[PDB]
């Protein structure tokens, strides 16, 4: 790989520089290189990886949605061709993330937090593939996303408090999956409300290191429930 000759510690350092420069493609490449050194990631490093790839795929998703809207309103091959170009790049990034998860990061060992974190990522990037998939392949990608979200939920419900930001973010995203991907708005609503209510009931479990993240995601759950009711 292009990062193979660089020290792991220098890759992490350069990922943090790229974050500060808002150079998220660079940041993702540096963190992919660090992952490939084969050592487990710390919590901080985990979240350098995730923010980098989320920003890359987030921009591709926003571009795809713009072109897709132009395309469906148009009903010359140019809009379809360019939408397909962006779609191919987006699928490539998702396949890169999913391969790193399967090949290096997901394991039968580590924090409960660690396994939930990467399993949530797997559900998310299968969801992004599902947003652009068609026909025979869509409903298979859906099943893959569901099984990763569900394994993550099973672990988080047993090993993490109901205010844990990863547990909350997982449920927020799984709830969106139900609504936008699986056409089950009632499962989406039930999960968001249950997650919010169980966080309130055990609000005493907020952690002084992460309570701002917890309460932020609790509002996002309320936001989606407002949007959906």
């Amino acid at each position: 790989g292009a990062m193979g000759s660089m020290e792991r510690a220098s890759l992490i350092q350069k990922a943090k520089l790229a974050e500060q420069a808002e150079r998220y493609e660079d940041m993702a490449a540096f963190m992919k290189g660090a992952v490939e050194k084969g050592e487990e990631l710390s919590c901080e490093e985990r979240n350098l990886l995730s923010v980098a790839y989320k920003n890359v795929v987030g921009g591709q998703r926003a571009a795809w949605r713009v072109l897709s809207s132009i395309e469906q309103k148009s009903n010359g091959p140019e809009v379809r061709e360019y939408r397909e170009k962006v779609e191919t790049e987006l699928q490539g990034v998702c396949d890169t993330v999913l391969g790193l998860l399967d090949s290096h990061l997901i394991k039968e060992a580590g924090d409960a937090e660690s396994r939930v974190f990467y399993l949530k990522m797997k559900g998310d990037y299968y969801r992004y593939l599902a947003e652009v998939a068609t026909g025979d392949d869509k409903k298979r990608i859906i099943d893959s996303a569901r099984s990763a979200y569900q394994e993550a939920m099973d672990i988080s419900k047993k090993e993490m408090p109901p205010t844990n930001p990863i547990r909350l973010g997982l449920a927020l995203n799984f709830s969106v999956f139900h609504y936008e991907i699986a056409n089950s708005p009632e499962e989406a609503i039930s999960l968001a409300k249950t997650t919010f209510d169980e966080a309130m009931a055990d609000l005493h479990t907020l952690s002084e290191d992460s309570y701002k993240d917890s309460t932020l995601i609790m509002q996002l759950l309320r936001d989606n429930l407002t949007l959906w009711t």
Binding site: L172, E180, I217, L220, N224
Partner: peptide, 5 residues
């Protein structure tokens, strides 16, 4: 769109 993190 709905919120995700």
């Amino acid at each position: 769109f709905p919120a995700t993190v």
